[PDB]
Amino acid sequence: AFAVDAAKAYKDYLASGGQPITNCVKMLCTHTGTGQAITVTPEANMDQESFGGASCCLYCRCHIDHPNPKGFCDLKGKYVQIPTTCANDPVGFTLKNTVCTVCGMWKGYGCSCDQL
Amino acid sequence: SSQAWQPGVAMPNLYKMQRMLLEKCDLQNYGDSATLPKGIMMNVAKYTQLCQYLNTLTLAVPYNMRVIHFGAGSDKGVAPGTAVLRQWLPTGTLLVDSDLNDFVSDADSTLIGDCATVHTANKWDLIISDMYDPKTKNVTKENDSKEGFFTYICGFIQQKLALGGSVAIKITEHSWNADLYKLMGHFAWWTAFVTNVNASSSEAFLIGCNYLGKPREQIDGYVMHANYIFWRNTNPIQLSSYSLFDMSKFPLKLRGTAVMSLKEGQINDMILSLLSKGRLIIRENNRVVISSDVLVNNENL
Numbered sequence: 001a002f003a004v005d006a007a008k009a010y011k012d013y014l015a016s017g018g019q020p021i022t023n024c025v026k027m028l029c030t031h032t033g034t035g036q037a038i039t040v041t042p043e044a045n046m047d048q049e050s051f052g053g054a055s056c057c058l059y060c061r062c063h064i065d066h067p068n069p070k071g072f073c074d075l076k077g078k079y080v081q082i083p084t085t086c087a088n089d090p091v092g093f094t095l096k097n098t099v100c101t102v103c104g105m106w107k108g109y110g111c112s113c114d115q116l
Numbered sequence: 117s118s119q120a121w122q123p124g125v126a127m128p129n130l131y132k133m134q135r136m137l138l139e140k141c142d143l144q145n146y147g148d149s150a151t152l153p154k155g156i157m158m159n160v161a162k163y164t165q166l167c168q169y170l171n172t173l174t175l176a177v178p179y180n181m182r183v184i185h186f187g188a189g190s191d192k193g194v195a196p197g198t199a200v201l202r203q204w205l206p207t208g209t210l211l212v213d214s215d216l217n218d219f220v221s222d223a224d225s226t227l228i229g230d231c232a233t234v235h236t237a238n239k240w241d242l243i244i245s246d247m248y249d250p251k252t253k254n255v256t257k258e259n260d261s262k263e264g265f266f267t268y269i270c271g272f273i274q275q276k277l278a279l280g281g282s283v284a285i286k287i288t289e290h291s292w293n294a295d296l297y298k299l300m301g302h303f304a305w306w307t308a309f310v311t312n313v314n315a316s317s318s319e320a321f322l323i324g325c326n327y328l329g330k331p332r333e334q335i336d337g338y339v340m341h342a343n344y345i346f347w348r349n350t351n352p353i354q355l356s357s358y359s360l361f362d363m364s365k366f367p368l369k370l371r372g373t374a375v376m377s378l379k380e381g382q383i384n385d386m387i388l389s390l391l392s393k394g395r396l397i398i399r400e401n402n403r404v405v406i407s408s409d410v411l412v413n414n415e416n417l
């Protein structure tokens with residue numbers, strides 16, 4: 001019945017003014033990539049930074065179980081593209097946002113599927 | 117320069133051929149630092165440059181390639197070097213990493229513990245080690261060949277590196293091993309490669325290219341480390357991050373190098389020649405299974 005809610009805790013810690021998780025592993029890349037959110041190799045475009053996925057996963061970084069009956073990690077072993085404007089807090093960004101299942105872009109940061 | 121636009125500098129062949137005596141390493145650029153791109157870690161830059169240099173060698177790159185990376189953790193609890201290796205290597209490459217201390221990684225599997233506890237059933241196509249004990253950097257005592265994890269690495273290479281495979285093992289002025297240099301003579305080619313981002317340090321990666329499983333050349337490792345220090349002492353390397361800004365050709369080309377199982381009797385000179393050219397890997401293609409030995413103790417009463 002009792003489960004630690006790590007996601008909520010980071011969110012509240014951030015709103016309380018706490019410093020975001022650091023030492024996310026930023027990759028060197030061309031920044032001419034597809035811009036999709038989570039990829040097998042860095043795919044940042046001109047407006048993004050690419051990061052090693054494990055280092056941007058709240059569950060990986062805080063040594064807690066993954067929110068998944070399988071415990072499978074969405075980010076470990078992959079690269080996550082983060083908008084440059086949000087790259088001071090990749091863990092926050094990945095937690096607070098969601099990937100369009102059709103085009104693979106971040107909803108609100110690349111996904112255009114909801115356009116006329 | 118020209119050198120400043122390369123990923124780093126490899127030890128020129130003539131320095132390998134000397135018979136120098138070991139001296140203290142005194143680097144002119146000691147204390148210089150390269151200007152890293154914004155927000156990029158030293159370890160990401162260093163591994164990027166290592167991989168850029170490895171792109172210029174005749175690495176064997178089979179389907180279902182197997183790579184193991186020792187010393188992969190950081191005091192930060194992450195694995196920047198692993199993240200670069202996985203970007204570099206073809207998608208699908210099996211990547212295992214390890215460190216004495218806990219860390220989270222993008223590797224397919226991670227083992228925490230002293231490297232001497234690590235065992236694998238299978239052979240590997242590439243071994244990378246950044247393992248280092250900063251207590252070796254003590255200038256008040258004599259600089260002898262070191263054992264420890266280097267003894268493990270030497271055995272691991274001879275027992276678990278596929279013929280045709282390659283290694284890159286980090287050394288410094290004081291972190292080195294004579295048998296490891298000697299084992300460089302069991303590859304078709306070898307060098308000591310210094311990254312341009314960390315050129316102010318006596319660090320180098322000892323690279324053995326295309327393993328042959330037997331000595332092609334007899335190397336005295338005490339002499340060769342003295343030769344390496346002599347080179348470093350007399351050839352200042354300009355700190356440079358220039359190569360980090362061009363990643364268009366970074367990925368390791370998937371060559372689909374052939375993998376064959378072969379018994380010792382079948383390694384003729386035509387096989388040895390293919391091995392030496394980066395055109396063949398000899399090992400089993402079974403499943404990759406690893407383990408870490410755990411010492412059990414009960415300290416109650």
Ligand SMILES: N#Cc1cn([C@@H]2O[C@H](CO)[C@@H](O)[C@H]2O)c2ncnc(N)c12
Nearest residue numbers: 187189215216217230231247248249265
């Ligand atoms: N001596 C020694 C070792 C040092 N390291 C690690 O190399 C990394 C140094 O950059 C660091 O993260 C460290 O924890 C070792 N890892 C496994 N087995 C060892 N025997 C060692």
Ligand SMILES: [Zn+2]
Nearest residue numbers: 057059060073
């Ligand atoms: Zn995770």
Ligand SMILES: [Zn+2]
Nearest residue numbers: 100103111113
């Ligand atoms: Zn979409």
